[PDB]
Amino acid sequence: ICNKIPGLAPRQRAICQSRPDAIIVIGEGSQMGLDECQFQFRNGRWNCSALGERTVFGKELKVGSREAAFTYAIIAAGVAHAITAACTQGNLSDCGCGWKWGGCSADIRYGIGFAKVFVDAREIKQNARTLMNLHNNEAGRKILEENMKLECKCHGVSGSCTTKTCWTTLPQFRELGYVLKDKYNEAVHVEPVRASRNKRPTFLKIKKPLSYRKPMDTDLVYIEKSPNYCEEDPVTGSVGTQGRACNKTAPQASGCDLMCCGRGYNTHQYARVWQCNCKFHWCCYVKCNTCSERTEMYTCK
């Protein structure tokens, strides 16, 4: 059934045929990772979109730059987060579990163990790009593991901490997206390592001076220089900045002067509806009128 789904390795498709329901959740997680990447880079010249066909893991990057590192890290983190959250929601029944003796094993370990193997199974080939890819996926999983919130409650003799329980919770994915954005702002350059006997690269070490150590497992790692991303070029996968909106102001990466790479801006009276002034409840439908005055949206030429 899913043997035709684009962008999966043969082992990934075998796993898909094994358990249809896990694939739904993992696809939702990959989509969540891609959506978070696109929200984080909404104002950037590279809006986390690439020239290519749609896959479960989005359009793949033809250059191994910092953008690809962040994309793969967020994809892996989203997959693991979705697996764990679906397990805790009751959407997955085989997850975790035993129950009457030991209270069942942890959820996060199951989620990470499944997501690690499946996501890394896409790396069918072996190349410096592949080692970078595996490093970035592992970094995403490690950063997701770091951001788990630990909570404890005491329920001892009366309310005392004679006996207290501690449990971990998944971080809400926007916070993890911000953390991975911060990590992306400090990604490290690398080249692979090669020896006479092995004849192929096994691991990777830092390019940047003052050090030659292996990059830390929680660092986002990239091997290729980043293009300008505002010129349309299929050899590099850049979609170009043409047609994208801009704020026509000084702030970095948001102004038309920086968005359009010197080509200027085109504007028109857009007049957004901008519905406002509602009597909000804690959720759900409320009645209110709209206040659409005017706007002139500037877009790159």
Binding site: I1, C2, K4, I5, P6, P20, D21, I23, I24, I26, G27, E28, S30, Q31, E53, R54, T55, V56
Partner: protein
């Protein structure tokens, strides 16, 4: 039973996929021709993010 799963694209966003659903399911009797017909019918590769294919894959277990 392909007919028993005809409800899956009531979740679909496009009416074109729904019309492709009804035409293929009441016109085709084999699953591989059915899936090729769907992908050529509303021009989208099977993706676990699409609610239509989500319903199809989920109901495949039932």
């Amino acid at each position: 039973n392909p007919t028993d799963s005809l409800y899956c694209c009531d979740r679909a966003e496009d009416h074109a996929c729904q019309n492709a659903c009804k035409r293929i399911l009441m016109s085709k009797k084999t699953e591989m021709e059915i899936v090729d017909g769907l992908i050529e019918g509303c021009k989208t590769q099977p993706l676990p993010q699409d609610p239509l294919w989500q319903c199809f894959l989920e109901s495949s277990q039932s």
